[PDB]
Amino acid sequence: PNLFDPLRVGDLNLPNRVVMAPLTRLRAGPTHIPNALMAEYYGQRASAGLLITEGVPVAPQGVGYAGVPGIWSKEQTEGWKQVTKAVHDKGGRIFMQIWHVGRISDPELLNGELPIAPSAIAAKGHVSLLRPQRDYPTPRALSTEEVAGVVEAFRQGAENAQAAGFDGVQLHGANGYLLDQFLQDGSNQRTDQYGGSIENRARLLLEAADAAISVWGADRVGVHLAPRADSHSMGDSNLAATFGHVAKALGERKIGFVSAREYEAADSLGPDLKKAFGGVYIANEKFDLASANAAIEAGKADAIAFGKAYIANPDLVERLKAGAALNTPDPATFYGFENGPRGYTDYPTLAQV
Ligand SMILES: Cc1cc2nc3c(=O)[nH]c(=O)nc-3n(C[C@H](O)[C@H](O)[C@H](O)COP(=O)(O)O)c2cc1C
């Protein structure tokens, strides 16, 4: 197949294999309530085979950025209904990315509380976007019973996404956030049932996945991974065995899809993870029209998610079909509530009259 061929993914027939990657934009602002501009933004992109939302924290403890939307409250759930209505009114399909940042945050975003983690080990470098610039804090290690609290927050988030009219949920198991912190032996030095073997390190991700499956059915659950461990101070002494284990466990659960942020190189685990998973595999990171087509024709991926191209190109599917020029993304308006429509809902389409 090629990028334009349909694909069945769980209980959905995608009309094409162009996916919108999850993209944090912070256009909700300090109430965390989704708004009509966010609804318009996803509706603009509804020609996608599948849309994935921006990461959505399942609890205030999972907030890493000012202006993120939430999925923990009824008022947030009501606000998301506008977004799913907008997408469904344009005949699109959308999953919510459900999220907990763990140690990748700052007490000023958590009402003075420490971010939480499997282990009291700070991420390297500075908190993104916050001024003045400051290092990540040493996080607070969860008790064993507080890990069950995290799973419950994921379950309730999966429930609220369902009440908000989503077609499914994708777990943010990627980019050094909480599930990835638990998964990798660089960040997880626990000695309870959540540390000290690949089985134990994968347990939180797989419990969160099982919570989502109980709400949605396996067909309406995806899991997002970053097997190169190249963002937010990640690292594991055997990435092939760690990610292989996750892929095989999710495959035994027959979930809708695995997605991965992982650019193509000789060291890519994607083809091995796709094989171990046995289901739909959505690749991502630095793909273009030709490399997307070549990867799908080679059976290396079933579909391709685009991040920065979908920021700048609401009609990306039509532009890729036409081999038309792409709008250049403006990184200065990727993030920030203040921006409103600017660099959000105002990128041009090919249409003129
Ligand atoms: C502004 C911006 C925000 C992002 N927010 C998220 C996020 O919320 N969840 C996530 O899993 N990845 C997030 N990513 C990563 C993208 O999903 C994607 O993996 C990355 O942009 C690489 O794909 P690309 O080369 O097509 O852009 C974000 C990337 C950008 C540029």
mmCIF file of C-alpha atoms and ligand atoms in Angstrom:
data_model
loop_
_atom_site.group_PDB
_atom_site.id
_atom_site.type_symbol
_atom_site.label_atom_id
_atom_site.label_comp_id
_atom_site.label_asym_id
_atom_site.label_seq_id
_atom_site.Cartn_x
_atom_site.Cartn_y
_atom_site.Cartn_z
ATOM 1 C CA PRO A 1 0.000 0.000 0.000
ATOM 2 C CA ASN A 2 0.821 3.760 -0.049
ATOM 3 C CA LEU A 3 -0.014 6.732 2.230
ATOM 4 C CA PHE A 4 -3.406 7.300 0.458
ATOM 5 C CA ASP A 5 -4.696 3.709 0.743
ATOM 6 C CA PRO A 6 -7.335 3.086 3.465
ATOM 7 C CA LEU A 7 -6.390 1.156 6.626
ATOM 8 C CA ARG A 8 -8.514 -0.521 9.313
ATOM 9 C CA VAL A 9 -7.194 0.460 12.789
ATOM 10 C CA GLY A 10 -9.078 -1.189 15.665
ATOM 11 C CA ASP A 11 -12.794 -0.443 15.040
ATOM 12 C CA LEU A 12 -12.153 2.391 12.483
ATOM 13 C CA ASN A 13 -11.669 2.461 8.699
ATOM 14 C CA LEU A 14 -9.172 5.270 8.069
ATOM 15 C CA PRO A 15 -9.705 6.657 4.523
ATOM 16 C CA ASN A 16 -5.914 7.344 4.310
ATOM 17 C CA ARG A 17 -2.768 6.648 6.373
ATOM 18 C CA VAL A 18 -1.941 10.300 7.172
ATOM 19 C CA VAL A 19 -2.148 10.718 10.975
ATOM 20 C CA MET A 20 -1.985 13.918 12.964
ATOM 21 C CA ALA A 21 0.717 13.428 15.635
ATOM 22 C CA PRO A 22 -0.048 14.611 19.191
ATOM 23 C CA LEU A 23 0.954 18.289 19.490
ATOM 24 C CA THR A 24 0.975 20.376 22.693
ATOM 25 C CA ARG A 25 -0.130 23.932 21.753
ATOM 26 C CA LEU A 26 -1.258 25.385 25.193
ATOM 27 C CA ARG A 27 -4.280 27.180 23.628
ATOM 28 C CA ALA A 28 -6.594 26.214 26.567
ATOM 29 C CA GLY A 29 -5.018 28.663 29.045
ATOM 30 C CA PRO A 30 -5.137 28.694 32.861
ATOM 31 C CA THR A 31 -8.728 27.274 33.223
ATOM 32 C CA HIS A 32 -7.561 24.136 31.278
ATOM 33 C CA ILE A 33 -11.053 24.150 29.610
ATOM 34 C CA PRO A 34 -11.071 23.413 25.858
ATOM 35 C CA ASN A 35 -12.511 26.248 23.724
ATOM 36 C CA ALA A 36 -14.088 26.889 20.310
ATOM 37 C CA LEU A 37 -10.640 27.778 18.776
ATOM 38 C CA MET A 38 -9.312 24.312 19.703
ATOM 39 C CA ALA A 39 -12.539 22.795 18.178
ATOM 40 C CA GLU A 40 -11.921 24.790 14.955
ATOM 41 C CA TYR A 41 -8.233 23.732 14.906
ATOM 42 C CA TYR A 42 -8.959 19.960 14.971
ATOM 43 C CA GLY A 43 -11.930 20.426 12.563
ATOM 44 C CA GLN A 44 -9.496 22.163 10.116
ATOM 45 C CA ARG A 45 -7.398 18.925 10.028
ATOM 46 C CA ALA A 46 -10.327 16.427 9.914
ATOM 47 C CA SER A 47 -9.340 15.158 6.407
ATOM 48 C CA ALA A 48 -6.550 13.241 8.288
ATOM 49 C CA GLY A 49 -6.959 9.445 8.367
ATOM 50 C CA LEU A 50 -6.820 9.858 12.171
ATOM 51 C CA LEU A 51 -6.266 12.803 14.533
ATOM 52 C CA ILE A 52 -4.448 12.451 17.864
ATOM 53 C CA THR A 53 -4.903 15.331 20.347
ATOM 54 C CA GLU A 54 -2.208 17.252 22.168
ATOM 55 C CA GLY A 55 -1.209 15.503 25.404
ATOM 56 C CA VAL A 56 -3.994 15.959 27.973
ATOM 57 C CA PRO A 57 -3.056 15.570 31.660
ATOM 58 C CA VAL A 58 -5.339 13.139 33.550
ATOM 59 C CA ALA A 59 -4.788 15.039 36.864
ATOM 60 C CA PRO A 60 -3.433 18.412 38.068
ATOM 61 C CA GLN A 61 -0.324 16.404 39.281
ATOM 62 C CA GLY A 62 0.299 15.528 35.572
ATOM 63 C CA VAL A 63 0.544 19.187 34.410
ATOM 64 C CA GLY A 64 3.971 20.178 32.936
ATOM 65 C CA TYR A 65 3.069 23.406 30.985
ATOM 66 C CA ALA A 66 1.006 26.571 31.555
ATOM 67 C CA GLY A 67 -2.181 26.576 29.433
ATOM 68 C CA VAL A 68 -2.578 22.789 28.880
ATOM 69 C CA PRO A 69 -6.133 21.439 28.642
ATOM 70 C CA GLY A 70 -7.251 18.801 31.215
ATOM 71 C CA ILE A 71 -9.469 15.681 31.183
ATOM 72 C CA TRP A 72 -9.980 15.298 34.992
ATOM 73 C CA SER A 73 -13.150 17.490 35.363
ATOM 74 C CA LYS A 74 -16.743 17.579 34.075
ATOM 75 C CA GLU A 75 -16.259 21.175 32.821
ATOM 76 C CA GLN A 76 -13.152 20.058 30.839
ATOM 77 C CA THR A 77 -15.099 17.032 29.458
ATOM 78 C CA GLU A 78 -17.894 19.470 28.342
ATOM 79 C CA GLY A 79 -15.296 21.702 26.581
ATOM 80 C CA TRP A 80 -13.845 18.664 24.719
ATOM 81 C CA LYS A 81 -17.361 17.832 23.369
ATOM 82 C CA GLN A 82 -17.029 20.923 21.088
ATOM 83 C CA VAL A 83 -13.777 19.380 19.665
ATOM 84 C CA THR A 84 -15.193 15.875 18.988
ATOM 85 C CA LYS A 85 -18.405 17.421 17.501
ATOM 86 C CA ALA A 86 -16.235 19.619 15.169
ATOM 87 C CA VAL A 87 -14.219 16.583 13.983
ATOM 88 C CA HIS A 88 -17.281 14.269 13.604
ATOM 89 C CA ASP A 89 -19.276 17.047 11.776
ATOM 90 C CA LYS A 90 -16.405 16.986 9.159
ATOM 91 C CA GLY A 91 -16.465 13.127 9.030
ATOM 92 C CA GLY A 92 -13.094 12.788 10.852
ATOM 93 C CA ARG A 93 -11.848 10.412 13.609
ATOM 94 C CA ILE A 94 -10.021 11.526 16.792
ATOM 95 C CA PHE A 95 -8.288 9.870 19.779
ATOM 96 C CA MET A 96 -7.328 11.782 22.954
ATOM 97 C CA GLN A 97 -3.661 11.479 24.050
ATOM 98 C CA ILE A 98 -3.946 10.959 27.859
ATOM 99 C CA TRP A 99 -0.873 12.073 29.794
ATOM 100 C CA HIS A 100 1.039 12.443 33.064
ATOM 101 C CA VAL A 101 4.372 14.343 32.858
ATOM 102 C CA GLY A 102 5.799 12.857 36.115
ATOM 103 C CA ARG A 103 9.166 14.479 36.913
ATOM 104 C CA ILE A 104 9.042 16.774 33.760
ATOM 105 C CA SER A 105 7.411 19.751 35.584
ATOM 106 C CA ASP A 106 7.989 22.499 38.202
ATOM 107 C CA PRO A 107 6.324 23.061 41.608
ATOM 108 C CA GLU A 108 5.049 26.485 40.321
ATOM 109 C CA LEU A 109 2.743 24.449 37.949
ATOM 110 C CA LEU A 110 1.685 22.042 40.762
ATOM 111 C CA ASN A 111 0.565 24.545 43.489
ATOM 112 C CA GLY A 112 4.080 24.297 45.107
ATOM 113 C CA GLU A 113 4.076 20.434 45.166
ATOM 114 C CA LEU A 114 7.031 18.403 43.798
ATOM 115 C CA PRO A 115 6.490 16.570 40.524
ATOM 116 C CA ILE A 116 6.250 12.793 41.059
ATOM 117 C CA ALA A 117 8.310 9.952 39.559
ATOM 118 C CA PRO A 118 9.165 6.287 40.079
ATOM 119 C CA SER A 119 12.474 7.479 41.709
ATOM 120 C CA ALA A 120 13.823 10.735 43.246
ATOM 121 C CA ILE A 121 16.121 11.481 40.229
ATOM 122 C CA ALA A 122 15.879 14.916 38.515
ATOM 123 C CA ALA A 123 15.775 15.111 34.705
ATOM 124 C CA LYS A 124 18.774 17.058 33.276
ATOM 125 C CA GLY A 125 18.475 20.596 31.857
ATOM 126 C CA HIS A 126 15.889 23.380 32.236
ATOM 127 C CA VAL A 127 12.066 23.259 32.502
ATOM 128 C CA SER A 128 10.713 24.144 28.970
ATOM 129 C CA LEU A 129 8.962 27.574 28.428
ATOM 130 C CA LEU A 130 9.132 28.766 32.151
ATOM 131 C CA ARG A 131 10.960 32.128 32.781
ATOM 132 C CA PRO A 132 13.291 32.767 34.371
ATOM 133 C CA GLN A 133 15.068 29.526 33.378
ATOM 134 C CA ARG A 134 15.453 26.855 36.113
ATOM 135 C CA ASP A 135 16.569 23.206 36.302
ATOM 136 C CA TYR A 136 14.045 20.404 36.754
ATOM 137 C CA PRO A 137 13.537 19.608 40.443
ATOM 138 C CA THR A 138 14.326 16.280 42.114
ATOM 139 C CA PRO A 139 10.863 14.638 42.056
ATOM 140 C CA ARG A 140 9.052 12.814 44.831
ATOM 141 C CA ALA A 141 9.114 8.993 44.425
ATOM 142 C CA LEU A 142 5.596 7.477 44.603
ATOM 143 C CA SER A 143 4.712 4.895 47.288
ATOM 144 C CA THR A 144 3.558 1.537 45.867
ATOM 145 C CA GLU A 145 -0.091 2.446 46.777
ATOM 146 C CA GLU A 146 0.264 5.920 45.068
ATOM 147 C CA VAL A 147 1.183 4.088 41.808
ATOM 148 C CA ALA A 148 -2.377 2.525 41.996
ATOM 149 C CA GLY A 149 -3.549 6.180 42.377
ATOM 150 C CA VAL A 150 -1.859 7.014 39.070
ATOM 151 C CA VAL A 151 -3.595 4.078 37.336
ATOM 152 C CA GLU A 152 -6.945 5.330 38.766
ATOM 153 C CA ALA A 153 -6.233 8.872 37.370
ATOM 154 C CA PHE A 154 -5.560 7.288 33.904
ATOM 155 C CA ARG A 155 -8.810 5.238 34.229
ATOM 156 C CA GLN A 156 -10.878 8.349 35.103
ATOM 157 C CA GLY A 157 -9.174 10.242 32.244
ATOM 158 C CA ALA A 158 -10.106 7.428 29.821
ATOM 159 C CA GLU A 159 -13.723 7.611 31.193
ATOM 160 C CA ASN A 160 -13.957 11.427 30.696
ATOM 161 C CA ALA A 161 -12.491 11.170 27.140
ATOM 162 C CA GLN A 162 -15.307 8.639 26.451
ATOM 163 C CA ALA A 163 -17.996 11.007 27.914
ATOM 164 C CA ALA A 164 -16.450 13.768 25.694
ATOM 165 C CA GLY A 165 -17.239 11.807 22.474
ATOM 166 C CA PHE A 166 -13.714 10.611 21.449
ATOM 167 C CA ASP A 167 -13.261 7.563 19.148
ATOM 168 C CA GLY A 168 -10.558 6.273 21.579
ATOM 169 C CA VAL A 169 -7.519 7.164 23.725
ATOM 170 C CA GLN A 170 -3.745 6.954 23.120
ATOM 171 C CA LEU A 171 -1.560 6.555 26.264
ATOM 172 C CA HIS A 172 1.401 8.983 26.320
ATOM 173 C CA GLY A 173 3.972 6.229 26.922
ATOM 174 C CA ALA A 174 6.716 8.350 25.259
ATOM 175 C CA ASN A 175 9.196 11.289 25.501
ATOM 176 C CA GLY A 176 10.374 10.684 29.105
ATOM 177 C CA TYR A 177 6.976 11.295 30.715
ATOM 178 C CA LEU A 178 5.654 9.288 33.685
ATOM 179 C CA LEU A 179 4.895 5.958 31.945
ATOM 180 C CA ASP A 180 8.306 6.135 30.112
ATOM 181 C CA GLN A 181 10.035 7.097 33.448
ATOM 182 C CA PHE A 182 8.673 3.818 34.942
ATOM 183 C CA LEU A 183 9.534 1.813 31.792
ATOM 184 C CA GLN A 184 13.273 2.685 31.550
ATOM 185 C CA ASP A 185 16.009 1.543 33.988
ATOM 186 C CA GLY A 186 17.796 4.959 33.742
ATOM 187 C CA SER A 187 14.886 6.692 35.568
ATOM 188 C CA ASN A 188 13.310 3.730 37.454
ATOM 189 C CA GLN A 189 15.426 2.400 40.394
ATOM 190 C CA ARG A 190 12.404 1.100 42.377
ATOM 191 C CA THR A 191 12.606 -2.254 44.279
ATOM 192 C CA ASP A 192 8.813 -2.887 44.522
ATOM 193 C CA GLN A 193 6.604 -4.606 41.867
ATOM 194 C CA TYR A 194 7.124 -1.490 39.587
ATOM 195 C CA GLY A 195 11.019 -1.793 39.442
ATOM 196 C CA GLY A 196 13.968 -4.165 38.918
ATOM 197 C CA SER A 197 12.930 -6.346 35.923
ATOM 198 C CA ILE A 198 11.572 -5.401 32.466
ATOM 199 C CA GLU A 199 8.239 -7.049 33.534
ATOM 200 C CA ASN A 200 8.017 -4.800 36.644
ATOM 201 C CA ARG A 201 9.171 -1.598 34.791
ATOM 202 C CA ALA A 202 6.486 -2.136 32.085
ATOM 203 C CA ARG A 203 3.809 -2.807 34.771
ATOM 204 C CA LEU A 204 2.594 0.852 35.190
ATOM 205 C CA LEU A 205 2.254 1.400 31.395
ATOM 206 C CA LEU A 206 0.445 -1.963 31.013
ATOM 207 C CA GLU A 207 -1.853 -1.313 34.055
ATOM 208 C CA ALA A 208 -2.752 2.116 32.588
ATOM 209 C CA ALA A 209 -3.352 0.377 29.210
ATOM 210 C CA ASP A 210 -5.580 -2.266 30.910
ATOM 211 C CA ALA A 211 -7.576 0.595 32.639
ATOM 212 C CA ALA A 212 -8.091 2.226 29.175
ATOM 213 C CA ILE A 213 -9.041 -1.209 27.671
ATOM 214 C CA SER A 214 -11.670 -1.793 30.424
ATOM 215 C CA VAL A 215 -13.291 1.635 29.497
ATOM 216 C CA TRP A 216 -12.950 1.516 25.689
ATOM 217 C CA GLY A 217 -12.254 -2.052 24.525
ATOM 218 C CA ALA A 218 -8.782 -2.935 23.124
ATOM 219 C CA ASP A 219 -9.790 -1.734 19.584
ATOM 220 C CA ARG A 220 -10.173 1.883 20.820
ATOM 221 C CA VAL A 221 -6.776 2.061 22.636
ATOM 222 C CA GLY A 222 -3.388 3.091 21.245
ATOM 223 C CA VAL A 223 -0.015 3.466 22.993
ATOM 224 C CA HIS A 224 2.650 6.051 21.993
ATOM 225 C CA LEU A 225 6.367 5.101 22.512
ATOM 226 C CA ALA A 226 9.837 6.716 21.930
ATOM 227 C CA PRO A 227 12.157 3.711 21.581
ATOM 228 C CA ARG A 228 15.344 5.804 20.901
ATOM 229 C CA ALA A 229 15.009 7.326 24.452
ATOM 230 C CA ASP A 230 16.392 10.632 23.092
ATOM 231 C CA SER A 231 14.072 13.140 24.869
ATOM 232 C CA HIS A 232 13.740 14.257 28.544
ATOM 233 C CA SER A 233 16.813 12.418 30.041
ATOM 234 C CA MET A 234 15.684 8.892 29.154
ATOM 235 C CA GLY A 235 17.934 5.834 28.629
ATOM 236 C CA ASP A 236 17.798 2.096 29.219
ATOM 237 C CA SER A 237 20.520 -0.572 29.314
ATOM 238 C CA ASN A 238 18.510 -2.709 26.806
ATOM 239 C CA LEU A 239 16.069 -0.666 24.735
ATOM 240 C CA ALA A 240 15.482 -3.608 22.308
ATOM 241 C CA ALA A 241 14.327 -5.943 25.162
ATOM 242 C CA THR A 242 12.419 -3.161 27.038
ATOM 243 C CA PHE A 243 10.440 -1.891 23.988
ATOM 244 C CA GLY A 244 10.173 -5.469 22.566
ATOM 245 C CA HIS A 245 8.493 -6.586 25.810
ATOM 246 C CA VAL A 246 5.984 -3.670 25.684
ATOM 247 C CA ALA A 247 5.214 -4.329 21.965
ATOM 248 C CA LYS A 248 4.625 -8.058 22.588
ATOM 249 C CA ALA A 249 2.448 -7.403 25.737
ATOM 250 C CA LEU A 250 0.273 -4.812 23.847
ATOM 251 C CA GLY A 251 -0.013 -7.262 20.909
ATOM 252 C CA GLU A 252 -1.285 -9.999 23.284
ATOM 253 C CA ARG A 253 -3.962 -7.412 24.322
ATOM 254 C CA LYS A 254 -4.853 -6.829 20.593
ATOM 255 C CA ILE A 255 -4.973 -3.029 21.047
ATOM 256 C CA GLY A 256 -5.886 -0.717 18.096
ATOM 257 C CA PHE A 257 -2.341 0.526 17.422
ATOM 258 C CA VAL A 258 1.178 1.274 18.638
ATOM 259 C CA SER A 259 2.618 4.641 17.551
ATOM 260 C CA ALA A 260 6.271 5.653 17.929
ATOM 261 C CA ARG A 261 8.215 8.877 17.654
ATOM 262 C CA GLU A 262 11.406 7.419 16.079
ATOM 263 C CA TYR A 263 13.111 8.797 12.905
ATOM 264 C CA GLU A 264 14.314 6.159 10.424
ATOM 265 C CA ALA A 265 17.986 5.159 10.813
ATOM 266 C CA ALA A 266 19.993 1.851 10.847
ATOM 267 C CA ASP A 267 19.328 1.700 14.661
ATOM 268 C CA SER A 268 15.455 1.983 14.328
ATOM 269 C CA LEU A 269 13.568 -0.565 16.527
ATOM 270 C CA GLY A 270 10.249 0.223 14.666
ATOM 271 C CA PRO A 271 10.352 -2.770 12.215
ATOM 272 C CA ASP A 272 11.117 -5.176 15.148
ATOM 273 C CA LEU A 273 8.385 -3.535 17.354
ATOM 274 C CA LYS A 274 5.847 -3.747 14.483
ATOM 275 C CA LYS A 275 6.681 -7.458 14.124
ATOM 276 C CA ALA A 276 6.456 -8.137 17.914
ATOM 277 C CA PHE A 277 3.188 -6.120 18.207
ATOM 278 C CA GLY A 278 1.568 -7.890 15.205
ATOM 279 C CA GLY A 279 -0.989 -5.096 14.675
ATOM 280 C CA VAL A 280 -1.132 -1.552 13.245
ATOM 281 C CA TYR A 281 2.153 0.381 13.678
ATOM 282 C CA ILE A 282 2.125 4.165 13.148
ATOM 283 C CA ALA A 283 5.646 5.560 12.571
ATOM 284 C CA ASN A 284 6.598 9.225 13.048
ATOM 285 C CA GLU A 285 9.483 11.728 13.163
ATOM 286 C CA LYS A 286 11.132 13.467 10.160
ATOM 287 C CA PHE A 287 8.946 11.644 7.565
ATOM 288 C CA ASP A 288 8.135 13.291 4.223
ATOM 289 C CA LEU A 289 5.894 12.241 1.314
ATOM 290 C CA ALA A 290 8.466 9.942 -0.373
ATOM 291 C CA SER A 291 9.803 8.353 2.867
ATOM 292 C CA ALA A 292 6.196 7.839 4.207
ATOM 293 C CA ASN A 293 5.220 6.092 0.925
ATOM 294 C CA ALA A 294 8.448 4.020 0.898
ATOM 295 C CA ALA A 295 8.012 2.906 4.567
ATOM 296 C CA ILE A 296 4.373 1.820 4.006
ATOM 297 C CA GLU A 297 5.221 0.046 0.695
ATOM 298 C CA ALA A 298 8.075 -1.841 2.488
ATOM 299 C CA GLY A 299 5.796 -3.023 5.366
ATOM 300 C CA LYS A 300 7.944 -1.026 7.893
ATOM 301 C CA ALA A 301 4.854 0.955 9.025
ATOM 302 C CA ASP A 302 1.100 0.813 8.365
ATOM 303 C CA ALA A 303 0.569 4.573 8.730
ATOM 304 C CA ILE A 304 2.613 7.778 9.296
ATOM 305 C CA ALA A 305 1.950 10.597 11.801
ATOM 306 C CA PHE A 306 3.142 14.115 10.949
ATOM 307 C CA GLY A 307 3.843 16.662 13.746
ATOM 308 C CA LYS A 308 5.298 20.009 12.556
ATOM 309 C CA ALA A 309 3.777 19.603 9.007
ATOM 310 C CA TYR A 310 0.285 19.349 10.621
ATOM 311 C CA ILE A 311 0.936 22.496 12.699
ATOM 312 C CA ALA A 312 1.549 24.494 9.498
ATOM 313 C CA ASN A 313 -0.778 22.643 7.043
ATOM 314 C CA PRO A 314 -4.452 22.108 8.007
ATOM 315 C CA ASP A 315 -5.034 20.583 4.546
ATOM 316 C CA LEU A 316 -1.834 18.426 4.788
ATOM 317 C CA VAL A 317 -3.665 15.394 3.230
ATOM 318 C CA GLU A 318 -4.700 17.407 0.141
ATOM 319 C CA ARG A 319 -1.161 18.965 -0.130
ATOM 320 C CA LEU A 320 0.544 15.496 0.047
ATOM 321 C CA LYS A 321 -1.968 14.080 -2.549
ATOM 322 C CA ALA A 322 -1.159 17.082 -4.848
ATOM 323 C CA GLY A 323 2.653 17.174 -4.132
ATOM 324 C CA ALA A 324 1.920 20.887 -3.383
ATOM 325 C CA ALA A 325 4.291 23.181 -1.414
ATOM 326 C CA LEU A 326 3.929 22.982 2.376
ATOM 327 C CA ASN A 327 3.533 26.021 4.613
ATOM 328 C CA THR A 328 6.674 26.612 6.759
ATOM 329 C CA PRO A 329 5.853 26.143 10.474
ATOM 330 C CA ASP A 330 6.479 29.199 12.732
ATOM 331 C CA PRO A 331 8.094 27.848 15.923
ATOM 332 C CA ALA A 332 7.481 31.153 17.789
ATOM 333 C CA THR A 333 3.678 30.310 17.834
ATOM 334 C CA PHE A 334 3.903 26.514 18.488
ATOM 335 C CA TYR A 335 3.172 27.239 22.198
ATOM 336 C CA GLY A 336 1.324 29.857 24.209
ATOM 337 C CA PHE A 337 -2.248 30.722 25.181
ATOM 338 C CA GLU A 338 -1.507 34.448 24.488
ATOM 339 C CA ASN A 339 -1.090 33.581 20.743
ATOM 340 C CA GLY A 340 -4.784 32.580 20.308
ATOM 341 C CA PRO A 341 -5.422 31.940 16.534
ATOM 342 C CA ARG A 342 -1.926 33.199 15.545
ATOM 343 C CA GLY A 343 0.184 30.218 14.324
ATOM 344 C CA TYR A 344 -2.801 27.991 15.291
ATOM 345 C CA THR A 345 -5.986 28.394 13.191
ATOM 346 C CA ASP A 346 -4.583 30.967 10.707
ATOM 347 C CA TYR A 347 -2.256 28.879 8.459
ATOM 348 C CA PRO A 348 -3.484 29.116 4.838
ATOM 349 C CA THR A 349 -5.157 26.315 2.815
ATOM 350 C CA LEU A 350 -4.686 25.905 -0.997
ATOM 351 C CA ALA A 351 -8.340 27.302 -1.350
ATOM 352 C CA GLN A 352 -8.683 31.015 -2.593
ATOM 353 C CA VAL A 353 -12.326 31.642 -3.923
HETATM 354 C C1 LIG B 1 4.987 21.912 19.313
HETATM 355 C C2 LIG B 1 5.078 20.417 19.532
HETATM 356 C C3 LIG B 1 4.362 19.829 20.552
HETATM 357 C C4 LIG B 1 4.396 18.445 20.784
HETATM 358 N N1 LIG B 1 3.589 17.903 21.768
HETATM 359 C C5 LIG B 1 3.561 16.571 21.864
HETATM 360 C C6 LIG B 1 2.639 15.939 22.755
HETATM 361 O O1 LIG B 1 1.747 16.570 23.363
HETATM 362 N N2 LIG B 1 2.613 14.554 22.758
HETATM 363 C C7 LIG B 1 3.491 13.802 22.076
HETATM 364 O O2 LIG B 1 3.429 12.533 22.229
HETATM 365 N N3 LIG B 1 4.402 14.354 21.251
HETATM 366 C C8 LIG B 1 4.419 15.683 21.129
HETATM 367 N N4 LIG B 1 5.261 16.281 20.216
HETATM 368 C C9 LIG B 1 6.071 15.441 19.327
HETATM 369 C C10 LIG B 1 5.309 15.145 18.022
HETATM 370 O O3 LIG B 1 4.137 14.301 18.231
HETATM 371 C C11 LIG B 1 6.217 14.439 16.996
HETATM 372 O O4 LIG B 1 6.677 13.171 17.511
HETATM 373 C C12 LIG B 1 7.426 15.250 16.538
HETATM 374 O O5 LIG B 1 7.000 16.558 16.160
HETATM 375 C C13 LIG B 1 8.196 14.639 15.380
HETATM 376 O O6 LIG B 1 7.356 14.474 14.243
HETATM 377 P P1 LIG B 1 7.551 15.446 12.977
HETATM 378 O O7 LIG B 1 9.011 15.345 12.479
HETATM 379 O O8 LIG B 1 6.503 14.994 11.966
HETATM 380 O O9 LIG B 1 7.291 16.813 13.546
HETATM 381 C C14 LIG B 1 5.223 17.655 19.976
HETATM 382 C C15 LIG B 1 5.999 18.270 18.985
HETATM 383 C C16 LIG B 1 5.911 19.631 18.737
HETATM 384 C C17 LIG B 1 6.737 20.254 17.639
#
